[PDB]
Amino acid sequence: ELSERGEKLPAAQRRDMMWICRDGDRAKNHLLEANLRLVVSLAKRYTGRGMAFLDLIQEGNLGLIRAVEKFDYTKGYKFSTYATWWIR
DNA sequence: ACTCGTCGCCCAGAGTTCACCTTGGAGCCAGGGACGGTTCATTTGGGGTGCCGGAAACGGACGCGTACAGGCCGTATAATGGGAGCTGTCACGGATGCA
């Protein structure tokens, strides 16, 4: 929003924004790497027809990325229950 | 004691060839119609036509609805590292990981 029709952000006011953005991206990556195990556990069930195990795994990672993007913690629900639908 | 089978013989004839009159014709030419292949006048019953009036089918154009086909999107107790594959060959020149 500030990029166009904003203000010239000083170093003090911009470094905080950059740091919190990087922290958020790092947290997203951490959650992805944590839930990859659920991804592979879910994807183990569709082998033997059509595609390969690695292809199924990568599709599971894509679904996990989508679920992480569309997750909502305010509902007070465990992440696996929501992510299973997207992975499937 | 004797003839009817068979021999020549003698005359009528007959149809045959020679060599004679007649007389129905083959053409042969002349002459004279009527007739039809031909030509030339009509003759107006009929073929023809161009054309748009124009009525109407018709073949397509055009604008606007409808239908499945394929595509995108989402489902909130929990669900967190995998099946498997069958391997009795022989030689061998050489790279290559560990000697």
DSSP letters spanning chain A = --SSS-----HHHHHHHHHHHHHHHHHHHHHHHHHHHHHHHHHGGGTTSSS-HHHHHHHHHHHHHHHHHT--GGG---HHHHHHHHH-
Entry field: residues in chain A: 88
Please give the backbone phi and psi of residue A22, each rounded to the nearest 5 degrees, phi first: -65, -40
Query: Which of the nucleotides lies closest to A77 (Cα–C1')?
Result: B76
CA distances, A15 to each of A12, A21, A28, A40 (Å): 6, 10, 20, 38
Cα A64 from Cα A32, distance rounded (Å) = 7
For the stretch A47-55, contacts whose Cβ atoms lie closer than 8 Å and that sit 24 or more positions apart, written own/partner, are none
Cα A87 from Cα A73, distance rounded (Å) = 18
Q: Find all residues with CB under 8 Å of A43, minimum gap 6, and list them.
A: A53, A56, A57, A59, A60, A87
Query: Which of the nucleotides lies closest to A82 (Cα–C1')?
Result: B76
Protein-to-nucleotide distance from the CA of A70 to the C1' of B60, whole angstroms:
56
Q: With b meaning 16 or more CB within 10 Å and e meaning fewer, what string describes A25-60? A: eeeeeebeeebeebbeebbeeeeeeeeeeeebbeeb
Question: Experimental technique used?
Answer: cryo-EM
Q: Is the CB of A79 under 7 A from strand B?
A: yes
Query: Which of the nucleotides lies closest to A83 (Cα–C1')?
Result: B76
Cα A61 from Cα A57, distance rounded (Å) = 6
Within 10 Å of residue A72's Cβ, how many Cβ atoms? 8
HSE, side-chain direction, 13 A CA sphere, residue A83: 27
